[PDB]
Amino acid sequence: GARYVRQVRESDKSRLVSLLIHGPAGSGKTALAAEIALKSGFPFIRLISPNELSGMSESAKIAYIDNTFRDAYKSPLNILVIDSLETLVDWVPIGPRFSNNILQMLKVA
Amino acid sequence: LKRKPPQDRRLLIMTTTSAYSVLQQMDILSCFDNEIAVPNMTNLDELNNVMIESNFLDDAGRVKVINELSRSCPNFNVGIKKTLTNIETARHDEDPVNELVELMTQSA
Ligand SMILES: Nc1ncnc2c1ncn2[C@@H]1O[C@H](COP(=O)(O)OP(=O)(O)OP(=O)(O)O)[C@@H](O)[C@H]1O
């Protein structure tokens, strides 16, 4: 994580770096991501979590996501933590059921 | 069910269910920190204890019904709710052992 942070800091052509942190349930992924982000020491850091979106409607959620991603296009250095991707799209394996709108929005974001 | 209370508050949640398999299929069994189990009645002495507590046996009835169901039913498994309902409905007509025996045999 520290190496990736340094690389994004220094390189002048790599203007977008994305990571995936996958593993078995209960393994402690969010703690590690938060630790890396904190120790990085960047001016601008944000986090998107399921807790913040509870009770809202689909349009409100999309609006919130778009606003948060737009707030990050200022300043010359930024960090964003997206938590538990699969529960942001309301996944359940019986159908399977999920939300195509939010998924497509994230895929384009 | 996985949100911590603000500041320094505390919370205990107890949720019941009867469709464990469905919850397993929905993949929602990771929100719980432990799992208690409640089994059925599986013995005659337990039925006797329920009877003494419900004021129905009158001693002789206890003996007659227990003796009848000892050989009239090899396997016995019923919940408390249905047992209490069966006792109550048996009380009205033919307080003798017969009615309870039929009710218990058919219910099990
Ligand atoms: N590398 C680590 N070393 C020590 N403790 C850790 C580590 N990573 C996580 N933890 C501990 O794990 C707990 C939090 O777990 P965490 O939410 O990160 O788990 P998770 O598997 O990502 O969660 P979820 O089940 O919601 O997907 C805290 O007690 C935290 O200290």
Swiss-Prot record, chain B:
Q: Where in the cell is it found?
A: Cytoplasm
Summarize the protein's role: Required for vesicle-mediated transport. Catalyzes the fusion of transport vesicles within the Golgi cisternae. Is also required for transport from the endoplasmic reticulum to the Golgi stack. Seems to function as a fusion protein required for the delivery of cargo proteins to all compartments of the Golgi stack independent of vesicle origin.
Which family does the record assign?
Answer: Belongs to the AAA ATPase family.
**Additional comment:** Present with 5920 molecules/cell in log phase SD medium.
Q: How is the subunit organization of this protein annotated in UniProt?
A: Homohexamer. Binds to SEC17.
**Can you say what this protein is called?**
Vesicular-fusion protein SEC18
The species this protein belongs to is Saccharomyces cerevisiae (strain ATCC 204508 / S288c) (Baker's yeast)
Instruction: Indicate the span of the full protein covered.
Output: 651 to 758 of 758
